[PDB]
Amino acid sequence: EAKHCVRIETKKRVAKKTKVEHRCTTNKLSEKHEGSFIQGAEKSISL
Amino acid sequence: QLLVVENTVEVAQFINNNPEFLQLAEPFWKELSHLPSLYDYSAYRRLIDQ
């Protein structure tokens, strides 16, 4: 999980101007692995 | 993968006599009696084919 988020606000008075901005981002990754291997051999020799 | 290889022997062996005491089968002997007494390979080839 990764998040980056910023909020900015400005007001100026002299005339009055204001700007406010909010920006946010979220990033997530999940990976799951599984593996199974089995091997077997038989030899039988009879006389 | 399976491999099975199996043998039964029930006649442990036969041992045929040497050629001096073997008896030829009458058809085979009759074929030998018609062999051309010379190298006519066609004839001996037919015999070996049989």
UniProtKB/Swiss-Prot annotation, chain A:
The lineage of its organism: Eukaryota, Metazoa, Chordata, Craniata, Vertebrata. This is Complement component C6. The chain holds residues 395 to 443 of 934 of the full protein. All cysteine residues are assumed to be cross-linked to one another. Individual modules containing an even number of conserved cysteine residues are supposed to have disulfide linkages only within the same module. Disulfide bonds join C5-C24. It is found in: Secreted; Target cell membrane. The chain crosses the membrane at residues 8-19. Component of the membrane attack complex (MAC), composed of complement C5b, C6, C7, C8A, C8B, C8G and multiple copies of the pore-forming subunit C9. It is linked to Complement component 6 deficiency: A rare defect of the complement classical pathway associated with susceptibility to severe recurrent infections, predominantly by Neisseria gonorrhoeae or Neisseria meningitidis. Belongs to the complement C6/C7/C8/C9 family. Component of the membrane attack complex (MAC), a multiprotein complex activated by the complement cascade, which inserts into a target cell membrane and forms a pore, leading to target cell membrane rupture and cell lysis. The MAC is initiated by proteolytic cleavage of C5 into complement C5b in response to the classical, alternative, lectin and GZMK complement pathways. The complement pathways consist in a cascade of proteins that leads to phagocytosis and breakdown of pathogens and signaling that strengthens the adaptive immune system.
Swiss-Prot record, chain B:
C-, N- and O-glycosylated. O-glycosylated with core 1 or possibly core 8 glycans. It is found in: Secreted; Target cell membrane. It is linked to Complement component 7 deficiency: A rare defect of the complement classical pathway associated with susceptibility to severe recurrent infections, predominantly by Neisseria gonorrhoeae or Neisseria meningitidis. Monomer or dimer; as a C5b-7 complex it can also form multimeric rosettes. Component of the membrane attack complex (MAC), composed of complement C5b, C6, C7, C8A, C8B, C8G and multiple copies of the pore-forming subunit C9. Component of the membrane attack complex (MAC), a multiprotein complex activated by the complement cascade, which inserts into a target cell membrane and forms a pore, leading to target cell membrane rupture and cell lysis. The MAC is initiated by proteolytic cleavage of C5 into complement C5b in response to the classical, alternative, lectin and GZMK complement pathways. The complement pathways consist in a cascade of proteins that leads to phagocytosis and breakdown of pathogens and signaling that strengthens the adaptive immune system. C7 serves as a membrane anchor. Belongs to the complement C6/C7/C8/C9 family. This is Complement component C7.
